[PDB]
Scaffold this motif. Sequence first.
Motif, short mmCIF file in Angstrom:
data_model
loop_
_atom_site.label_atom_id
_atom_site.label_comp_id
_atom_site.label_asym_id
_atom_site.label_seq_id
_atom_site.Cartn_x
_atom_site.Cartn_y
_atom_site.Cartn_z
N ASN A 197 0.83 -1.18 0.00
CA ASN A 197 0.00 0.00 0.00
C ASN A 197 0.88 1.26 0.00
O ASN A 197 0.39 2.34 -0.23
N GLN A 198 2.19 1.11 0.25
CA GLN A 198 3.09 2.26 0.28
C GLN A 198 3.14 2.93 -1.09
O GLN A 198 3.12 2.27 -2.15
N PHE A 199 3.20 4.26 -1.06
CA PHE A 199 3.35 5.09 -2.23
C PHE A 199 4.07 6.36 -1.81
O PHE A 199 3.94 6.82 -0.67
N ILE A 200 4.83 6.94 -2.73
CA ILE A 200 5.60 8.13 -2.41
C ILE A 200 5.32 9.18 -3.47
O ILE A 200 5.16 8.85 -4.63
N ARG A 201 5.27 10.44 -3.06
CA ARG A 201 5.22 11.55 -3.99
C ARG A 201 6.57 12.27 -3.93
O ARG A 201 7.11 12.52 -2.83
N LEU A 202 7.10 12.59 -5.11
CA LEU A 202 8.49 13.03 -5.28
C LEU A 202 8.52 14.16 -6.33
O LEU A 202 7.94 14.02 -7.41
N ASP A 203 9.18 15.27 -6.00
CA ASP A 203 9.21 16.42 -6.88
C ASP A 203 10.56 17.15 -6.79
O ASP A 203 11.18 17.22 -5.74
N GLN A 204 10.98 17.72 -7.92
CA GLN A 204 12.21 18.51 -8.01
C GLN A 204 13.39 17.69 -7.46
O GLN A 204 14.14 18.17 -6.60
N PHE A 205 13.55 16.46 -7.96
CA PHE A 205 14.72 15.69 -7.64
C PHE A 205 15.86 16.21 -8.52
O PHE A 205 15.89 15.99 -9.74
N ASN A 206 16.75 16.96 -7.87
CA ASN A 206 17.76 17.73 -8.52
C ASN A 206 19.13 17.16 -8.17
O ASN A 206 19.34 16.74 -7.03
#
Length: 421
Positions: A197-206
């Motif tokens: 059920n785990q989920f991740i939200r990820l943004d601006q991986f720089n």
Amino acid sequence: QLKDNLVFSLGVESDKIKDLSGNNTNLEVKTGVQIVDGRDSKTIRLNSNENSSIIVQKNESINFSYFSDFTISFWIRVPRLNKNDFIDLGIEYDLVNNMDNQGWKISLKDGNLVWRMKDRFGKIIDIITSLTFSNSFIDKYISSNIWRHITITVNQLKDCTLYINGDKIDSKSINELRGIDNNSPIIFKLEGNRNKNQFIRLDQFNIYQRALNESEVEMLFNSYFNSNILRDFWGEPLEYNKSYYMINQAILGGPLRSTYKSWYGEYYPYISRMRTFNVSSFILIPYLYHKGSDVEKVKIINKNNVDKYVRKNDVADVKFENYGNLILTLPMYSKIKERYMVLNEGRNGDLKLIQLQSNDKYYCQIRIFEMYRNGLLSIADSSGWYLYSSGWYLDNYKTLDLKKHTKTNWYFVSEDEGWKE
């Protein structure tokens, strides 16, 4: 001008996942990856299935050779620690992986974040954050469902440093480490977690081709809050005409309720006593939604809005949805001269949502403008606490002790899949 050293930036633009750095890095985004609402328009969401991955072939610019300093930064939103996560108790699992025989990875473990480097001799250096829900829930704990900004700086031969929200958390000497370069791709994917059920939200991986100093990391963090929009509890833009739970920072688990006082002609909103649940015997979590209760839902309303977003210093009403037509206001001074707030159809003064701290705070303050009872919205000092307009807190804001500052900070929370109760 941190952009000068930016060699890779993973995000969403025009409905597509791209390298935003301009370097046109080749990505393979598999069909299990989703694009969802985020902290600044859309964000990547990774789910616990095999089709939910992004593979990035490295090139010369994306290089982790021994003679190259680098920085990794990213926004992450990890679901609030829940019972399903305990199947992975004590087990590290991958989020971002550039590890073959050697290299680096970013993992999750027991609600915390792992950075690990391994060189070609098997020499290992890791940072494992050691945050606890009780002490760090609001400001830094990872498995909180709150947007966190992570920065990792690598000065090869000197030190590795980890930051959350622009604050240095930990550091390790890496003078013993040799090369971690490899020819494998960077894989963005949940790998090793039994909790599917785990989920991740990820943004601006720089990725940056320099190790940022402590001042530069603060500046990078600050650069994500350059606008005057207020924020919700999760760190997403605060909106008009959106159902929220309204919470006082001093009692996170205290539900906003209302009571008709027959004596006066008035409904009074109040914060009830703190409600908590147990995820384990050792971890208490505050209720935010209070499902199956009389909790008051609110919407922020402003007929002079320009878009859906609430900005610092907007004049707006807080409408109580349970009642349909009542707003948070003061009673008529002639009737009731006290500073306690009531719920009334009759607008009596103005509310302004303000930010007296920095733009990065996920709470706001609320300024009451009224002929006799100007103040900041607070809770009075128990069973529950009435809302009131504090003239004292307004006039002495800059000097208030921590507790009083805390009582004048307000959050708005919306239901999210990443926080279950």
